[PDB]
From Swiss-Prot, chain C:
Residues of the full protein shown: 2 to 152 of 179
Protein name per the record: Small ribosomal subunit protein uS7
Additional record remark: The strain K12 sequence is shown. Has been predicted to contact the N-terminal domain of IF-3 based on footprint studies; exactly how IF-3 interacts with the 30S subunit is controversial.
Naturally occurring in which organism (per UniProt): Escherichia coli (strain K12)
GN (gene name): rpsG
Signal peptide: none
Keyword S-adenosyl-L-methionine belongs to the record: no
GO molecular function terms noted in the UniProt entry: mRNA binding; rRNA binding; structural constituent of ribosome; tRNA binding
Keyword annotations from UniProtKB, A to Z: Ribonucleoprotein, Ribosomal protein, RNA-binding, rRNA-binding, tRNA-binding
Keyword field contains Nucleus: no
GO BP annotations, alphabetical order: cytoplasmic translation; negative regulation of translation; ribosomal small subunit assembly; translation
Assembly notes: Part of the 30S ribosomal subunit. Contacts proteins S9 and S11. Cross-links to IF3 and the P and E site tRNAs.
Native organism taxonomy: Bacteria, Pseudomonadati, Pseudomonadota, Gammaproteobacteria, Enterobacterales
Family named by the database record: Belongs to the universal ribosomal protein uS7 family.
Curated annotation (Swiss-Prot), chain D:
Record flagged with keyword rRNA-binding: yes
PANTHER family to which the protein is assigned, alphabetical: 40S RIBOSOMAL PROTEIN S14/30S RIBOSOMAL PROTEIN S11
Lineage summary: Bacteria, Pseudomonadati, Pseudomonadota, Gammaproteobacteria, Enterobacterales
Gene (UniProt): rpsK
Assigned protein family: Belongs to the universal ribosomal protein uS11 family.
GO cellular-component term (any): cytoplasm
Protein name: Small ribosomal subunit protein uS11
GO biological process: cytoplasmic translation; translation
Highest rank taxon of the organism: Bacteria
Subunit text: Part of the 30S ribosomal subunit. Interacts with proteins uS7 and bS18. Cross-links to IF-3. In stalled ribosomes contacts ribosome rescue factor SmrB.
Misc. remarks from the entry: Has been predicted to contact the N-terminal domain of IF-3 based on footprint studies; exactly how IF-3 interacts with the 30S subunit is controversial.
Amino acid sequence: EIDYKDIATLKNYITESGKIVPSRITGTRAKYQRQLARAIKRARYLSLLPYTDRH
Amino acid sequence: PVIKVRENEPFDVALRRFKRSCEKAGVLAEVRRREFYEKPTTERKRAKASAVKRHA
Amino acid sequence: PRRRVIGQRKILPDPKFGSELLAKFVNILMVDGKKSTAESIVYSALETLAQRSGKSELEAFEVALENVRPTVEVKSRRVGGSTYQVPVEVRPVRRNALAMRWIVEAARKRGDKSMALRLANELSDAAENKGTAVKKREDVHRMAEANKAFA
Amino acid sequence: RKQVSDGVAHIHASFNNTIVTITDRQGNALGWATAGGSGFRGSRKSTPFAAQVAAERCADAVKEYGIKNLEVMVKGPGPGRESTIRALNAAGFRITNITDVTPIPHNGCRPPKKRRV
RNA sequence: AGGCGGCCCCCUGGACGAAGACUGACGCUCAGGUGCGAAAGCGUGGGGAGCAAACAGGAUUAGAUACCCUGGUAGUCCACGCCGUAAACGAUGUCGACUUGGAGGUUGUGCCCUUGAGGCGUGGCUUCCGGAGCUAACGCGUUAAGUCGACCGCCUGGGGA
C-alpha cells in the first residue's frame, strides 16, 4: 500500500496466482488500493509480489 | 500454478477445489475477451450497460 | 393433473386368487371390458405354467415379472429446444403395471397356437427372462444411464 | 516406462471439448487425451461425462510409467475441468491442493465482439 | 469540455477549509475576432501483438455478394499537419438575487472529556424522496422544469432539403 518494501501485508492483496485481488473484497480506501499497484507492477522489477507459481 | 498431490487424499475431495480455484476469474471466460474483436465503445457501454444492471 | 392431483382406481381383488396386484394384470389383459373371458386367460396360463415351473404356480408368476419390472424410466423435459430426458425412479405401484403391461403386449407377437402356448412360454421364459418383455426393460435400461449426467 | 511416481495432468477444458495432458515436472509431456477425441462430435464433445470419459481415456496410458502422484492444471470454464477431474478420482489418486492457473491480462488485447447471431 | 485510471521526476493548471492585509465598482455579457477541440481517415517517417474493412475460402438458404466458421488488407502503437465534424445530452444558454422539505455520500474544517469508531457547527460538490409551484402531460421540483435582474443565441405546416 503505502510502500512497496512491505510485501508481507501487500500479499493479502494478491491471490495465490499473483493477480492482484480486487480491493473491493479487501476493502481499503479507494486511494490506498492505488498505492498497492504502484508497489506491485513497477516494483515487480524489484520482485515484490510473485507472478505465479509456474517455474 | 502447482496443484500438488498429498498422501491419502482422494482426487474427489479436491474435485470441488479444482473448479473453485480458477472460477475466481475463469480461464476461458476471460478468454472470452480475446476470441474476437471488440470496439472500446462496447466495454464503456459494457461498463455502462453492466453499471446499470448493477443498481439493485 | 396440472391443478388437480389424482389417484388410482382400486380395482377389485381376484375372485379366485384374491390378489389386488394380480387384479391389474387381468385388467391390463382385460380388453373391451371382457372380464368374462379376461381372467380365464389369466387363470389358464399359470395352471399350464405351474406344470413347467416346478417351484410353484402363483409364485412363478412373480419370479418372471421381477425380470421385466421397470426400475427407472425417462420423463421428457422439452423446454429449450433439445429433447431432454430427465430420469426418475418410478413408484413400483405403477412399475408393476408397467411390468405386467409389457409382458402382455409381447405374447400377441408370437407364432404359437394360442396365448396359452404364447403366454405360458413367455412367463416361463420370463422366469429366466428370455422372452420379449425382459429385453424390453433392458432397452429402457440404457436410455437412463447413457443420459445419466443429462438428468 | 521409467517409473516417475510424480506426473502432471494438464486439463484443457475447452468450450467445445476438454483436453487433458499428462506431463512430468520439467513439463515434458508424457501423455495427453481429449474429451472430443473420445467419441463425442459436435455438440456432444463439450459435455461433462464427455470430459469424464476423456479422463478415462486420459487417465490410462499415463500410469504405464508407474506414475504415483501428479499435480493438476485447472483451465477455464466449460463442460470439462470438473468431470475430467472426477474420472481421475476413479483411479484412487492423491492431490494436495488446486491453484488457479489463469493468465489475468492487465488490459491487453482489444476485446471480442459478441456473435451477432 | 471533449476527454482523463498500472508505477516514478519537471512543470502546469485548475479547484475548495481557518483567520489576518491589500485596491477599491477595477463588473457580466460579446457581433466581429481569437484557441482548443470525441472518433475515423488521409498525407508524410517509423513501427508493427491483436487482429479486423475491403478482399479469399467454407456453410444456410429458393436464393444469403450476410448473419454461422478459416483467412484476411488497410488501420489500430512512436513524429509533423489536415481535416474540426458526432445521441460532444441532464435533449436543460450564460451570469447575480429569493424559496417548504425529506432523506444519504463525499470532501475541508471548529467544536465535544473522540470520555469510543461518536455529538454539536462552519463550506463544496454530489446521490435518492418530494411542499409549493408549474407544466400538454409526462414530471420537475433549493443544482428549479416555482419567484426576479443583464447579455447572447434561435423557430415560424409537411415534403422537396
